[PDB]
Structure 1
Amino acid sequence: AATTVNGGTVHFKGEVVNAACAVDAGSVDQTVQLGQVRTASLAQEGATSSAVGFNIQLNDCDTNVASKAAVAFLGTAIDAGHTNVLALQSSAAGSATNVGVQILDRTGAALTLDGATFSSETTLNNGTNTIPFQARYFATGAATPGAANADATFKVQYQGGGGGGAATTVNGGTVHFKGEVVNA
């Protein structure tokens, strides 16, 4: 049993209420727990954690509106030279330093934190779909232990409604990257 929706066709139309799929509660506001990471793996620019695959569960997809979906991500950039990488959160004086989060499409290519840098077009289907992603902590130098939390949002660029492109970039949900770094 679908077991979804409050009771009515979406009786709230403030904004761009066009999302082909309604995004599961278990995916809109997801806490991606990357766990503790060793500072060993975070010691030069380009060093990375073990990484983790997270996905976006899109319920009651319609293919008339959009036979496809992309996502984009947005957060505080760790630095100017790293507009691809999140700045953690909380204690900017007690979390880890020289490390941030990244988000990669399913191919493994690092997405940019502009909220409009779309990613790997998952051809959808009627019913239920999931776009997988990867995430991992990226060091920009000699990283340190402490805490490693961040909170992006993600967006959903639907597309594939006719003509040849036809795209709609709605919001998508919160991505609470949680985890920490330990001094090995």
Structure 2
Amino acid sequence: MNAACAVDAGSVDQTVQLGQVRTASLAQEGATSSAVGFNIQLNDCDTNVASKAAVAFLGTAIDAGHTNVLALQSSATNVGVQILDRTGAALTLDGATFSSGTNTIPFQARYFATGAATPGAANADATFKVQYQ
């Protein structure tokens, strides 16, 4: 009887707005920007289905040194995007790092510099994996 959840990041086409990339905040490797919040919604399902699910992300790392920093799509460089949990903790992009208002999954996103960031726009893609119990 129980159906899976209608998943929605943002409001349309799974699109999340990021902040602007200020190079003066990202001048060096290890430098981070301020983090913008976003939510992923698990709609139209039993609240015990949604909560008891295991979620993970999957994307191309910026370099081998930074496997939890998501690369960009060229056009700012020396910088990628990082996704954080509810309290500000980075998450992996290998797609094997689980586990578990109503049915909201709160996230944050921020820029991680891998060096002196050059100006330009930052557009990044990834995949969000929902695996049901």
TM-score, normalized by the shorter chain, greater than 0.5 = yes
Q: Secondary structure of the residue that 1:66 maps to in structure 2?
A: helix
The Cα offsets for residues 86-132 of structure 1, whole Å up to 9 and x where unpaired, read as 110136xxxx1110000011121110111221255xxxxxx941010
- Give the percent of matched residue pairs that are identical in Structure 1 and Structure 2: 99
Aligned length: 133
Which one is further off, 105-114 or 30-39? Answer: 30-39
Shift of 1:70: 3.5
User: Which of structures 1 and 2 has the bigger CA Rg?
Assistant: 1
Structure 2 residue runs of 5 or longer lacking an equivalent are none
The alignment's TM-score, normalised by the length of structure 1, stands at 0.62
In structure 2, relative to structure 1, the CA distance for the partners of 1:97 and 1:62 (3 Å cut) is same
In structure 2, relative to structure 1, the CA distance for the partners of 1:114 and 1:57 (3 Å cut) is same
In structure 2, relative to structure 1, the CA distance for the partners of 1:146 and 1:49 (3 Å cut) is same
- The answer to whether the 8 Å contact 1:46/1:141 transfers is yes
- The answer to whether the 8 Å contact 2:79/2:117 transfers is yes
In structure 2, relative to structure 1, the CA distance for the partners of 1:149 and 1:19 (3 Å cut) is farther
In structure 2, relative to structure 1, the CA distance for the partners of 1:140 and 1:60 (3 Å cut) is same
The Cα offsets for residues 19-78 of structure 1, whole Å up to 9 and x where unpaired, read as 632224856832222132210111122211221001111112225656423421111110
In structure 2, relative to structure 1, the CA distance for the partners of 1:155 and 1:18 (3 Å cut) is farther
Which one is further off, 107-116 or 56-65? Answer: 56-65
The alignment's TM-score, normalised by the length of structure 2, stands at 0.83
Structure 1 residue runs of 5 or longer lacking an equivalent are 1-16, 121-126, 160-184
In structure 2, relative to structure 1, the CA distance for the partners of 1:128 and 1:27 (3 Å cut) is farther
Whole-Å separation in 1 of the counterparts to 2:120 and 2:108: 23
Q: Secondary structure of the residue that 1:64 maps to in structure 2?
A: helix
Whole-Å separation in 2 of the counterparts to 1:116 and 1:101: 19
